[PDB]
Design an enzyme around this catalytic site. Structure first.
Site, PDB file in Angstrom:
ATOM      1  N   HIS A  58       1.141  -1.114   0.104  1.00  0.00           N
ATOM      2  CA  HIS A  58      -0.051  -0.187   0.136  1.00  0.00           C
ATOM      3  C   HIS A  58       0.971   1.023  -0.127  1.00  0.00           C
ATOM      4  O   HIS A  58       2.154   1.160   0.260  1.00  0.00           O
ATOM      5  CB  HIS A  58      -0.802   0.001   1.377  1.00  0.00           C
ATOM      6  CG  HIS A  58      -0.787   0.963   2.050  1.00  0.00           C
ATOM      7  ND1 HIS A  58       0.927  -0.093   3.248  1.00  0.00           N
ATOM      8  CD2 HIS A  58      -1.404   1.428   3.403  1.00  0.00           C
ATOM      9  CE1 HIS A  58       0.668   0.292   3.542  1.00  0.00           C
ATOM     10  NE2 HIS A  58      -0.415   1.339   4.548  1.00  0.00           N
TER      11      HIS A  58
ATOM     12  N   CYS B 100       3.512   5.269   5.433  1.00  0.00           N
ATOM     13  CA  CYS B 100       3.775   4.317   6.634  1.00  0.00           C
ATOM     14  C   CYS B 100       5.782   3.921   5.801  1.00  0.00           C
ATOM     15  O   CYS B 100       5.904   4.360   5.569  1.00  0.00           O
ATOM     16  CB  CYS B 100       2.943   2.829   5.614  1.00  0.00           C
ATOM     17  SG  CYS B 100       2.937   1.783   6.851  1.00  0.00           S
TER      18      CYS B 100
ATOM     19  N   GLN C 203      -7.350  -2.623  10.116  1.00  0.00           N
ATOM     20  CA  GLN C 203      -8.498  -1.478  10.325  1.00  0.00           C
ATOM     21  C   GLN C 203      -9.083  -2.484   8.864  1.00  0.00           C
ATOM     22  O   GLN C 203      -9.334  -2.596   7.788  1.00  0.00           O
ATOM     23  CB  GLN C 203      -7.961  -0.050   9.758  1.00  0.00           C
ATOM     24  CG  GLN C 203      -6.620  -0.046  11.467  1.00  0.00           C
ATOM     25  CD  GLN C 203      -6.622   1.539  10.793  1.00  0.00           C
ATOM     26  OE1 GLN C 203      -7.775   2.716  10.930  1.00  0.00           O
ATOM     27  NE2 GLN C 203      -5.543   1.491  10.249  1.00  0.00           N
TER      28      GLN C 203
ATOM     29  N   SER D 289      -5.567   5.785   9.711  1.00  0.00           N
ATOM     30  CA  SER D 289      -4.641   5.864   9.001  1.00  0.00           C
ATOM     31  C   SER D 289      -4.614   7.151   8.020  1.00  0.00           C
ATOM     32  O   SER D 289      -3.735   8.176   8.813  1.00  0.00           O
ATOM     33  CB  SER D 289      -3.429   4.699   8.782  1.00  0.00           C
ATOM     34  OG  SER D 289      -4.016   3.417  10.195  1.00  0.00           O
TER      35      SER D 289
ATOM     36  N   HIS E 125      -5.623   5.378   1.587  1.00  0.00           N
ATOM     37  CA  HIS E 125      -4.351   4.166   0.845  1.00  0.00           C
ATOM     38  C   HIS E 125      -4.366   3.265  -0.828  1.00  0.00           C
ATOM     39  O   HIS E 125      -5.764   4.118  -0.935  1.00  0.00           O
ATOM     40  CB  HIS E 125      -4.895   2.337   1.509  1.00  0.00           C
ATOM     41  CG  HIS E 125      -4.517   3.114   3.116  1.00  0.00           C
ATOM     42  ND1 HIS E 125      -4.041   2.450   3.461  1.00  0.00           N
ATOM     43  CD2 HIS E 125      -5.243   3.730   4.080  1.00  0.00           C
ATOM     44  CE1 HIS E 125      -4.172   2.723   4.798  1.00  0.00           C
ATOM     45  NE2 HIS E 125      -4.914   3.056   4.643  1.00  0.00           N
TER      46      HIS E 125
HETATM   47  N1  LIG Z   1      -0.548  -8.154  11.083  1.00  0.00           N
HETATM   48  C1  LIG Z   1       0.745  -7.033  10.907  1.00  0.00           C
HETATM   49  N2  LIG Z   1       0.778  -6.572  10.410  1.00  0.00           N
HETATM   50  N3  LIG Z   1      -0.598  -5.826  11.963  1.00  0.00           N
HETATM   51  C2  LIG Z   1      -1.706  -4.758  11.883  1.00  0.00           C
HETATM   52  C3  LIG Z   1      -1.580  -4.307  12.615  1.00  0.00           C
HETATM   53  C4  LIG Z   1      -1.293  -2.926  12.258  1.00  0.00           C
HETATM   54  C5  LIG Z   1      -2.935  -2.690  12.116  1.00  0.00           C
HETATM   55  N4  LIG Z   1      -2.389  -1.123  10.896  1.00  0.00           N
HETATM   56  C6  LIG Z   1      -3.529  -1.302   9.782  1.00  0.00           C
HETATM   57  O1  LIG Z   1      -4.586  -1.440   9.875  1.00  0.00           O
HETATM   58  C7  LIG Z   1      -2.889   0.528   9.104  1.00  0.00           C
HETATM   59  C8  LIG Z   1      -3.899   0.181   7.588  1.00  0.00           C
HETATM   60  C9  LIG Z   1      -3.529  -0.626   6.403  1.00  0.00           C
HETATM   61  C10 LIG Z   1      -2.190  -0.675   7.179  1.00  0.00           C
HETATM   62  C11 LIG Z   1      -1.591   0.468   8.456  1.00  0.00           C
HETATM   63  C12 LIG Z   1      -0.721   0.695   8.674  1.00  0.00           C
HETATM   64  C13 LIG Z   1      -0.044   1.247   9.941  1.00  0.00           C
HETATM   65  C14 LIG Z   1      -0.430   3.005   9.867  1.00  0.00           C
HETATM   66  O2  LIG Z   1       0.677   3.941  10.114  1.00  0.00           O
HETATM   67  P1  LIG Z   1      -0.133   4.405  11.581  1.00  0.00           P
HETATM   68  O3  LIG Z   1      -1.316   4.307  11.301  1.00  0.00           O
HETATM   69  O4  LIG Z   1      -0.809   3.174  12.729  1.00  0.00           O
HETATM   70  O5  LIG Z   1       0.289   5.182  11.942  1.00  0.00           O
HETATM   71  N5  LIG Z   1       1.228   1.078  10.795  1.00  0.00           N
HETATM   72  C15 LIG Z   1       0.843   1.059  11.697  1.00  0.00           C
HETATM   73  O6  LIG Z   1       1.630   0.251  12.985  1.00  0.00           O
HETATM   74  C16 LIG Z   1      -4.216  -1.809  12.668  1.00  0.00           C
HETATM   75  N6  LIG Z   1      -5.097  -2.963  13.003  1.00  0.00           N
HETATM   76  O7  LIG Z   1      -4.069  -0.502  13.111  1.00  0.00           O
END
Ligand SMILES: N=C(N)NCCC[C@H](NC(=O)[C@@H]1CCC/C1=C/[C@H](COP(=O)(O)O)NC=O)C(N)=O
Length: 146
Positions: free
Chosen positions: A42, A96, A114, A137, A140
């Protein structure tokens, strides 16, 4: 009968039918054609209303939602015309941490990301890209790799 999320739409400027996916925000002229895990890259553009208005690109992120959306639109435009590839733009421009890995997030199942991201990710087929996908976040562009 059209894959999950896809609907037929009518172009305002040309009168031609096109296809739109209300889960991924993908849109295309072409007629389109579940797993435990998907792998996605992404490109994230954060804004002032992001859950964490900060990234490696700048300490204080202050651009508005509307401005972030216009950047996302412009990147999609460059990707679609083949001016720039996705991975190149993510490395340069994604707010990111996964920018250092060309936007790659590795594999993930349902209940990890999310919800808007997750739904979009799982409605993509391998090789496909999303339109703008909104989460807490930021905005995307999602590319499903596996
Ligand atoms: N299995 C894995 N890799 N762990 C999933 C847990 C993290 C997940 N994160 C996200 O959903 C956002 C949306 C897609 C990518 C993403 C990246 C975020 C973006 O950076 P931030 O907004 O946090 O500052 N980074 C996370 O540190 C969440 N449940 O919040």
């Amino acid at each position: 009968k059209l894959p999950p999320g896809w609907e037929k739409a009518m172009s305002r400027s040309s009168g031609r039918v096109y296809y739109f996916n209300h889960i991924t925000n993908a849109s295309q002229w072409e007629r389109p054609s579940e797993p435990a895990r998907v792998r996605c890259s992404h490109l994230l553009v954060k804004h002032s209303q992001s859950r964490r208005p900060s990234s490696w690109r700048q300490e204080k992120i202050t651009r508005t939602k509307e401005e972030a959306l216009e950047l996302i639109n412009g990147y999609i435009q460059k990707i679609k015309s083949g001016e720039e590839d996705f991975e190149s733009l993510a490395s340069q421009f994604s707010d990111c941490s996964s920018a250092k890995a060309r936007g790659d997030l590795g594999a993930f199942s349902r209940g990890q990301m999310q919800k808007p991201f997750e739904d979009a990710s799982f409605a993509l087929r391998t090789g496909e890209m999303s339109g703008p996908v909104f989460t807490d976040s930021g905005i995307h562009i999602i590319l499903r790799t596996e």
